Each structure stands twice: as C-alpha cells, then as structure tokens.
Amino acid sequence: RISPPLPF
Amino acid sequence: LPPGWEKRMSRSSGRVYYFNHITNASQWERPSG
C-alpha cells in the first residue's frame, strides 16, 4: 500500500 | 547511513529498499549514491 517509486 | 534509514522489503519488485522516517524519504536506489 505504501510502495515507493525509484529515484531513477 | 543515519539510524533512521532502515532496510525494508518493497512490495512490487520484492526489493530491499532503504526507508527513512526522519527525512520521511524512501530510496530503492542507494541513499549514499
């Protein structure tokens, strides 16, 4: 539910 | 990396991403570059 997009 | 940086398992890729709650920032990619 809380998953991050990668900065690259 | 500061104590606030934990290595936590991410959902989609099943990846060990660095999550920090002091900055509230989240980095799959390495925080130190």
In sequence order, the β-bridge partners of residue B10 are B15
Distance of CA B1 to CAs B9, B10, B13, B16, Å? 17, 19, 23, 15
For chain B, the farthest-separated pair of C-alpha atoms sits apart, in whole angstroms, at 26
Q: Which residues contact B18 (CB under 8 A, 6 or more apart)?
A: B1, B5, B6, B7, B8, B26, B27, B28, B30, B31
What's the total number of domains in chain B? Answer: 1
For residue B20, give its domain range: 1-33
The verdict on a CB contact (< 8 Å) between A4 and B29 is no
Q: Domain containing B30 — which CATH number?
A: 2.20.70.10
For residue B2, the SS3 value is coil
φ/ψ (deg, to 5) at B22? -80, -40
Residue with tokens 């799959």: B28
> CA angle A5-B13-B15, nearest 5°?
90
Q: Method of determination?
A: NMR
| Residue of B9, B20, B27 to mutate, interface with A, max A Cβ within 10 Å | B27
